[PDB]
Every structure is written in structure tokens, then in C-alpha cells.
Amino acid sequence: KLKEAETRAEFAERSVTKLEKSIDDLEDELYAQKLKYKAISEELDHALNDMTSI
Amino acid sequence: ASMDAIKKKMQMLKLDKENALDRAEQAEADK
Amino acid sequence: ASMDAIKKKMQMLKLDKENALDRAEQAEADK
Amino acid sequence: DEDETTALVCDNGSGLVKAGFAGDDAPRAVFPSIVGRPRHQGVMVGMGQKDSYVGDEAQSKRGILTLKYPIEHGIITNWDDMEKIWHHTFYNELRVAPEEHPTLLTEAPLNPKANREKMTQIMFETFNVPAMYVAIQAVLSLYASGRTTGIVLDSGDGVTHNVPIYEGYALPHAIMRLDLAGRDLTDYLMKILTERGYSFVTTAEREIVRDIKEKLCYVALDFENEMATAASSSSLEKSYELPDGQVITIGNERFRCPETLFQPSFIGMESAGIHETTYNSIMKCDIDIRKDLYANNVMSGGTTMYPGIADRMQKEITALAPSTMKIKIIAPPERKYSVWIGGSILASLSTFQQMWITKQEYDEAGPSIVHRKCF
Amino acid sequence: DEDETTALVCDNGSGLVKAGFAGDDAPRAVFPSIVGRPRHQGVMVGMGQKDSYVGDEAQSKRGILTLKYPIEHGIITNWDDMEKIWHHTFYNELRVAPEEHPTLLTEAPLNPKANREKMTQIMFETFNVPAMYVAIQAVLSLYASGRTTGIVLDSGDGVTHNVPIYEGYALPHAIMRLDLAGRDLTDYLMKILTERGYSFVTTAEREIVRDIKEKLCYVALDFENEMATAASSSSLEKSYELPDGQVITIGNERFRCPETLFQPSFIGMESAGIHETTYNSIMKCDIDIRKDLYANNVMSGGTTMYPGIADRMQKEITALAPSTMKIKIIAPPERKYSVWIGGSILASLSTFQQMWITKQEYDEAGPSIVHRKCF
Amino acid sequence: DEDETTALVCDNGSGLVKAGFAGDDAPRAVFPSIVGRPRHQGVMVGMGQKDSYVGDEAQSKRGILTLKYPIEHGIITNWDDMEKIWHHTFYNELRVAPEEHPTLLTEAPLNPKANREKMTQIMFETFNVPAMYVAIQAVLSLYASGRTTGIVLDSGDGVTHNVPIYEGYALPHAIMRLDLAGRDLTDYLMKILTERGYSFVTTAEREIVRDIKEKLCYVALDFENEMATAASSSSLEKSYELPDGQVITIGNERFRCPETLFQPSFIGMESAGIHETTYNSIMKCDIDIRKDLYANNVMSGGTTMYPGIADRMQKEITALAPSTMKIKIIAPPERKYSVWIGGSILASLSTFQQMWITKQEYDEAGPSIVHRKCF
Ligand SMILES: Nc1ncnc2c1ncn2[C@@H]1O[C@H](COP(=O)(O)OP(=O)(O)O)[C@@H](O)[C@H]1O
Numbered sequence A: 001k002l003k004e005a006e007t008r009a010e011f012a013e014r015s016v017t018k019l020e021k022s023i024d025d026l027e028d029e030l031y032a033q034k035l036k037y038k039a040i041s042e043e044l045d046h047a048l049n050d051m052t053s054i
Numbered sequence B, C: 001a002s003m004d005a006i007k008k009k010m011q012m013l014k015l016d017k018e019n020a021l022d023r024a025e026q027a028e029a030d031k
Numbered sequence D, E, F: 001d002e003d004e005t006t007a008l009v010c011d012n013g014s015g016l017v018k019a020g021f022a023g024d025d026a027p028r029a030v031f032p033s034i035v036g037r038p039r040h041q042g043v044m045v046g047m048g049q050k051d052s053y054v055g056d057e058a059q060s061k062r063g064i065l066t067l068k069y070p071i072e073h074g075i076i077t078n079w080d081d082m083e084k085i086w087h088h089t090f091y092n093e094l095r096v097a098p099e100e101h102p103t104l105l106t107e108a109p110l111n112p113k114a115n116r117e118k119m120t121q122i123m124f125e126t127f128n129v130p131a132m133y134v135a136i137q138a139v140l141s142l143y144a145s146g147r148t149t150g151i152v153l154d155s156g157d158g159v160t161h162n163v164p165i166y167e168g169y170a171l172p173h174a175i176m177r178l179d180l181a182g183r184d185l186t187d188y189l190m191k192i193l194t195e196r197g198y199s200f201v202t203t204a205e206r207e208i209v210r211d212i213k214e215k216l217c218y219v220a221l222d223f224e225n226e227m228a229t230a231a232s233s234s235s236l237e238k239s240y241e242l243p244d245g246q247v248i249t250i251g252n253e254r255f256r257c258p259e260t261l262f263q264p265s266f267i268g269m270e271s272a273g274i275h276e277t278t279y280n281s282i283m284k285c286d287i288d289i290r291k292d293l294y295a296n297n298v299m300s301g302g303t304t305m306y307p308g309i310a311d312r313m314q315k316e317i318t319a320l321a322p323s324t325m326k327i328k329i330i331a332p333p334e335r336k337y338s339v340w341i342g343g344s345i346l347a348s349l350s351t352f353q354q355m356w357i358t359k360q361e362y363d364e365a366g367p368s369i370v371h372r373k374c375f
């Protein structure tokens, strides 16, 4: 039962480690989405707010 | 979905150019 | 995409209209 | 067992002493930082019986011994007892004579200098070690964790120092020393268990409460919510079996002990806790350092064993920490053993073999030399 | 990695380092003129760690570094740090070696002669460049913009030069060298952001402010009107996100900083502003020159990229200038990097291949030779 | 209890508050800027006991209070707590109601706008002051010293502002704001006293170390030689008596603390020190100004009372300064009380009565008015 519980705890620990990595990657991806979005939405608000004369 | 600023001024500045170009030719012909 | 199309079209039209206008003004002003 | 003259590595706190040979991933011997002494008059003769007992001997015969430890809130106060602990650990358990091996001892950077001088003197004068080095506990914790950058929250038995390091460099102006550790958490629990009807004041009793704490307590992700339930329902009580066959059940007291880490006022301390120092050490670091330390706050030492602490700490720091930035706590398996492991990593580096105080430089200068040679 | 002995071209200013090869239309790479050094004591062993970092390395590891710029308002003083910047620029970016290529560097017309002599000395003695040529930034600014006649308004990080050139000739008596630059704007913005409750005094803070300025600032055509609304409403505010997750909201400081270019008294400078220096440099020229210079005020360098700057200066010059005559500012998109382009144009002219100092003439005469060979 | 409607002078800093009546030569009410609150559970009933204690009350009952400072690094962060300090200072100690006494407050030249307007608002809306003024500490320091010209080094607990004035005019471009002050020197001492075996972290301990610093520390004229002997012999040690009858003996920490003024890296600050900032405040002024500022280097505020500091500074500036030039420090025994004295001189000046903002102008414009009316 222990080997199975340790398998589950370690399985899950290995899996949670992978999931934690997925979160770290996911958040970096999220930041990229937000940062690129922010950069694009803002570079346009500003590009159009300054580039108004054409 | 043009931004009005760009559509309206690109056309107006384009027109200032075209009108000025024609005025230059016209006035030059007079002068 | 910042408005790259505009940044250059803007320079093109401001320069072209300013030059055309400078020509319009000179064409008449030269008398 | 060792087949080479590798460096010996030994981490020494107010709790336990971990020791082994450099190059491994674990100490090969772990002993309590305890020297025991009998408090009774003998009547039978031809019974053996020691004047003093050390480490596991001290605990095994503890029924009639008073048990004392040599290290208080990070420093050695009793060098004689440390010599006994190291003598036993090195010669009887690890079966090694330090005379033929360099030895690495550890402390955090704000540890009073007398501690580094005593560690150096004992190994050079009573063990005749050919060389010494005293390393920073935060340095070793980051090596064990696979980091060069991070904040080491060494919530051990004695003192917590919470030392920030960036690219392998100290940021000493930001070390927020805290007078809260596992030994105080034990005292809190002894008082609250007294309220429940179980007085624990003598050595055997003090050891029981320490054992209860280590096996039954957890931090609680949400203190108030966990207490609202634990205070209302017996289903959250955990039963601990006392050495004499009697039992004690512990309810919300099970988490109120470690809660002192988030509520130091529980033991009379003027502090908000380990998460507050985690936050203040990073807060005082350079603005272009902070992002790397916030994504790498590091647990080290013991008390980190609380299956409630992993989420409790990240929640508490995230709550104070800046937006946009990724906020993360590293809670590695190399916990409760990270300093020893880091010690092995440091001691075995080729780049560290020029860092040793030799037993030449030592005798010419005396033990104060450690203050100029180590860091 | 080049297949021809094309000249290398580089603008090594107080701000940015721009570099590429002659014949291109842009620098291949641009980075800050920075050499950084650790301001902390190392504690981890086997961490690598340089004594000094260069360019993007200096910024990437800046959390524990103090960052220095070897060029002081247009002149090179820390030639040792610049040797490192050049080596990095050439070998780790362009992947060229000056030993196999002639090299062109540039400076303002009233730049102290020491700058041209030291740049010549190092490229010949430490990089073994076969030839050298120190160019005039004003010459290069008009080549890139397409003029033989006009005013060079090179308003970048170091110094504003203000020089009239007619038919390819200098009109040096009318040069208005002014101690007003992009570098002063960064420090001024740090002070007015302090007024708002966000103090900035350190290198990291200075690099943050330089980023705020580069992304949020503008001058506006009408300062007082822009000021009146920015000072009265959140509608003209813009936020900035700091490296550590803090957010700063900036109002009229967004333009009050840049406005120093027109009102130098904001930083304690005895000056009427960049539009008056442009105006007077033309007014000191003969009337058969003025008609062409007023119609060709030419922007080069940073700060010329601020919204309202070409319109702001043209308006003020026009207001000071006589009627009938036309006043115009030339402000091409190839801004801030146009002097590099001019360097490429000069370096690649057939009429310029006789202007090089060779590494023969150099050793016979020494570095003072640049003072006679270049211009 | 006063016989005239004279404005009060209240130099309220991050450390202490010096308050009194304009026209006199000294403050009458001197309190620490402290509001204290109990951190313990009461057992006895009918014991009085306040929710908060202020000034001397906060220190007299401090054994069980946590003590906080409403002012940090030059600004008010907690204005409600300043109302408590002010009410006591005005009504109990000075025994005056602000309703008939306009009151002069002090600030640094680059101090955030929010602080100057918040001080104005509290005095007009909570104390119903008939008029207000917020003064520059540098102005007040020069009046007290009999000068219109000089560098004011206001080196107190909060911020060192390093601000030049010439012929009564500000030279703001040359103000060198520095993030190094008396509060940091106290923190540094707590950390190095920890190294000696005496950790200080709690309120009682923080107050003790500040008192140790004020009584035992000095700079002298040569750090390295002073350290060579202090680190080698008991002959340079001084004992300090702790409140419970125990003592602490302090060696080179006695000078290593204030040496941070010349070596800011001791607390992790990116700075060359107070003499570099003094020098730059002089050097960044015009060449025909520099001679008068070199001859009028003015000590003001706290830390100016470290033995050897007036001469240490003259030596350190002289070392950076051109030869021939006379560098002189103004350092009267009225050191640190000079801001209060200037406040008295300015507030009571007939030439300055029109400079007071009345409680007419205040309500029409709001508290931001202080920014336009005081200077
Ligand atoms: N499950 C647990 N619960 C509470 N505390 C623990 C647990 N496991 C380990 N610790 C604590 O670990 C401490 C000793 O290890 P350590 O922190 O590495 O000493 P140090 O780092 O100061 O040299 C003891 O106080 C022990 O109670």
C-alpha cells in the first residue's frame, strides 16, 4: 500500500512537477499573450493618436 | 475599419498635394 | 503592427503635398 | 564508508547535526544536537553507565537524563558539547578521522562571528583537521536547490535569517533576521497543550512535544477557515500516542503551533512572520534583482515540512508581491537537508579547493583567521 | 564573415552604439555604450562572473552592476571600456575584425580634438585597423537626409551641435554648440517623477526612466495648452510598467521633460532653446545663404523623434524669421540612426577613398595625424 | 500661553520634531516623531491605557508598545498620526492653539508634491490655522548661519538633500538627492552589532541602537588607520549601558557606521558618498558660483554631530576640489538646531509676511496652493 501510496505520491509529485512546469510555461505564454496584446493595442492607440495627420 | 484620422487626413493631404500640384502648373502657366 | 504603412505614407504625403504646395505658392509668387 | 580523502561536510544547528562525505547527496549520519546527563543516584554497581551521552545515546537513555543542546539561535554556546557530537559523529558513525580530511562547517552571513571562530578552532585543535572552511547556509541552500539566484528562508530550529543572493552575490543589506524558529514553535505548543490538560515541562516531556509537532502539525492554507472547522469538529483532531501508552488528541492546536510563523505575536515576538521577512528581504533588493528573486523564493532548512506551508507561503508572498511578475516559491525535496547537500556540492567543487584555510595559516593566525579567509 | 574589405562604420555616442558595414542603409545592430561592473561581494563558488560586462550583457546582469558610459557628452574618456565596446560591436555582433577592414567613426564639428586622437590611437594600436577616418556628424547627417545645404540639428543624447552647411561648405562662425541633450532629459525626468512620489536616483532607476522617456514622452506643438490640460485631467496621463511590476502614472511630466529642449531653464541652463540656436545659426550667415538654410532645417539624432518636435521648432523659427521666405524642417523616418547611414554613405564614396589615414602614416606620425588628415 | 500671535515653527522630520514659537532662538517642544501602540493583551482592569501614545508618552511606556514613525525619508506617510503628534506638540507642550498661530513647516526642495500639500491641508482643515507656510530647510539653515550662499547638507534621519543656494536663489539643477541618512546608519549598526553577539531588531532594541549611535559613533579624519587600531585593540572600545543594567562594548563598529556616509556601499547603496554629492552640488553650478559655494559648505540637521565630521568633509571636498581654491565648512554649535532657528527668522520676518497663505486663498485653491505660493 505504501509503495502504491509512494507511487501515487511520487507519481503525482513527478506529475505535479510537470504541471508546475506547465504553469511556469503557461504563465510565460500568458505574459507573452498579454504583453504582445498590450504592446499591439497600445502601439496602435499611440501610433494612431500621434499619426493622425495621414 | 479605417481609423478616421488616417483615412480622412490621408485623403486630405493627398488632395492638398494634387490641388497644389495643379495650382503649381496653372499658376506657372500664368506666370 | 504599429501603423508602418502610415508612418511611410505619412512621410510621403506630407512631403509630396508640402513640395506641391511649395510649388503652388512659388508658381504664383514668382509673378 | 569512504575510499578517498574527500572533504567532510557537517551542518550544525540547535536541532540536529547532519554529516557525511563530500560528493554524496545525503549525510551518512544524522544525530540530535544533544548531550545528555544523568540526574539520579546510582544504586546497582557493575552497570556501566556514562557520565554523559551523545546524540542517539542521549535520546536512547533519556528516561533518567537531562538533555541539553550546544547551539542557541544560530550560535555555539557550548564548544565542549560540539566536540563530543563531532567526535561521535565522525569517529563512531562515519568512521573517519578528520586529521586526514578537510572539513566544511556552515552558518548564515549574520551569524555572530564567535560561531565561525569556534567552528574553526575545534576542528583545528581537537580534531587536527588539515583544513577548514565556513560556508554560508544560503549559499549551500541555493546549490542544493539548483539555483544561483533566490532567497533562502532558513526556517530551522534556532533562527531564521532569510538571506537573498543574486548571481551568486550577497545582498547583505537586505538580510532580515527573525527571532522565530522551530524551538519557539515547540514552546507555543507546550503551552497550548497545557490548556488542553497535558503539562509538558521536563526533558522527556519536552522531547514528546517536539516529536508531536514534527509529526502532527501543518500550517493551514487558510488559518481562520481551518480554525472555524477545527474548533467546531473533533473530526480534525489527530491522535498522538505518548511513550507510556497514553494518548493526546490535538485539534486546532495542530495548526496554531506553525501559525506562529505567520503570527509571531503568539510567542510575544514583534513580527508578522516568515512571509513578512521573505517580503522585506526582497523589497530591499535592487529593483532589477527583484524579478528574479520573486520567481525564486527558496525554502530551506526544516519547518518547511508542513504540508500546509507550501501553499500558505506562496499565497502570503503573492499577496504582497508585484503584479505582472511571476511570483513563485521553490520547495525542493532537498529540504531539511539542503544545507548539508549544498555543503557536499561546494566541498567537492574543483573551484573550491583554493578556498581552504590550511592547518598552517590557522596556527600562525589563530581562529580569528576565519573572519578574513571565508567571507 | 564579410566577403569584401568594406569599411566598418560606427557611431559610438554617450547613448547608443550604432554599427554596421559601409554600403548598407542601416546599422546591423544597435546597443547602449555601456560597460557594467559588480557592486556586490560574491558568495557562491564556481559561478563564473566577469569583472565587467558589455552592452546588452551589462544591461542583462544590471541587477548587481553599476553601469558606466565611456563617452561623456560626445567625447571618449574611458577608452578602456570603449575598447571592450568596440570589440563586442565588431566581433560579437557584426562578426568582423577591424584588422581586415578600414574603420569610420564620427564626432560633432566642435568636439574637442582629444576625441578624434584617442579614437584613432586605439583603433590602430589595439585593433590593428589598416586605416582610419574620423567623420563629422554634421556631414553624415546631411548625407543621410539628402542635403548639401541646411542646418544640422543633431539633438541626441550627448550634445546639440546646430551647424549650418552651404553647398558642402562649413559656415563655422555660426555654429551654436549647446549643452542641452537627451541625457539631461533623462535626469530631469528622474527629478520631476520624484515630485510625483516616485523617486529615481540609481543606475537601475536611471535606465527605467530612460525607458519611460523613450516610450511615453513628446513635446507638443503648444506647450502651455498641453500643460494646462495635462495638469487638470487624467485624460492626458499615461501609465508605465516598471521591471519590478510597479506602475507609475505620468501626467504633464510626459512633455515638461522634453519641453526643456525649448525651455532649457527647466534644468538651469542659460539658453533660449533649440529653435533659437537654429534661428541664430542661420541669421549669422549671409542673406544669399539664409534663403536656403531656413527652408532646410534638418533633424538627426534622438529627441527629434518626439511628437510635435518638427512642428514646434518650425513654428518658433517661423515666428522669429521674416515673412515671404519659407521656413521648413526636414525630419525623415531614418531619425536617430541617420548619422550611421551618413557614415555608410561617406565610407562608400569613391571620392572618399583618398581620405583614409593608413596604418603607415599613422605610426610614422602618431594619433595626432587625425587632426591633419581627416578635416 | 504665549503673549503674541506669532507663527509656530515645527521642523517635523523622520526622526524628531523641533517645535517652538517664531521670534525665539530655540524650540520649546522637542519630541520624537513617534506614535506608539500596545502589542499585548491586558489582564488588569481600570488601568487607564491609551489606544495610542505620542512623543514622549510613546517612549515612556514603550516597554509594551510597538513604535512607529509617521514620517519616512522626508515625507508624511501617515497624516493621521501626524495630527496626533501635532495636537500634543501644540496644545499640551507648546500650549498654543494654531487657530491664532499660522505655523511654518519644513521640507526638502525635491520632496514629493503630495507631502507639501498634505501638510497644508491638515493644518487648514483639522487645526483651522489662519494661514500656512512650508519652508525649505536649506533656506532656514542659511538664515541661521548668517548666509545667503552655500551648500546645505541637511544630512538628517530621512534624506540628505545636498542643495546649493546662491545670493538667496535656488540652483535646483545642482541638487543631488541622496538615499543615505541617519536611519540607515542606525540599521547598519544593528547589523554589525549582531556580528558582535548583540542582535537588535524589536522596538526597544531599535531605540537603543539609535541612542548608541548618537552617543558612541564618530568619523574622524582617516578610516583605515582608525580601523587598523580599533580592530586590533581594546584601547579604542567604548562601552554603552543598556536599559536593564547590562552593557555592550563596541569597537570599530563605532566608526564603521557613520563611515557609510563616505562609503554608502556598506548598506548596499549605489553612491560615492556625501562628499561626492557636496562636491557635485558645487561643481554643477556655474564657474563664477563655485568659488562662493566652496567657501560656504554648510552643515545642517542631524549626523553633523559625529566627531570629526565638519573637518572630515572639508578634507574630502578639498580632495576633489581644484587646488588654490579655499574650501570651507560652516559648522557652528547651533548645528542641527539651525533649521528651527531659520524657521523662526523667516516666519517672523516683515519681508515675508505676504508669503503666508491665508485661509481664504487656501479654500479657493485647495492645498496644492502651497506649491505656487511658498517659493
Ligand atoms: N515535519 C516537520 N515539522 C516541523 N518542523 C520540522 C519538520 N521536519 C523538520 N523540521 C525541523 O528541522 C529542524 C532542524 O533542521 P535544520 O533546519 O536543517 O537546522 P539548520 O538549518 O538551522 O542547520 C528542527 O527544528 C525540526 O523540528
Ligand SMILES: Nc1ncnc2c1ncn2[C@@H]1O[C@H](COP(=O)(O)OP(=O)(O)O)[C@@H](O)[C@H]1O
Pocket: E011, E013, E014, E015, E016, E137, E154, E155, E156, E157, E158, E182, E183, E210, E213, E214, E215, E300, E301, E302, E303, E304, E305, E306, E336, E337, E339
Ligand atoms: N522614442 C524616442 N523618442 C525620442 N528620442 C529617442 C527615442 N528613442 C531613443 N531616443 C534617444 O536617442 C538618443 C541616442 O543618441 P543619438 O542621437 O543616436 O546620438 P547622435 O547625436 O550621434 O545621433 C538617446 O538620448 C535616446 O533616449
Ligand SMILES: Nc1ncnc2c1ncn2[C@@H]1O[C@H](COP(=O)(O)OP(=O)(O)O)[C@@H](O)[C@H]1O
Pocket: F011, F012, F013, F014, F015, F016, F017, F018, F154, F155, F156, F157, F158, F182, F183, F210, F213, F214, F215, F217, F300, F301, F302, F303, F304, F305, F306, F336, F339
Ligand atoms: N551625535 C549624533 N550622532 C549621530 N547622529 C546624530 C547626532 N545628533 C543628531 N543626529 C541624528 O539626527 C537625526 C534626526 O534628523 P533631523 O535632521 O534632526 O530631521 P529634522 O531637521 O526635521 O529635525 C537622527 O537620526 C539622529 O540620530
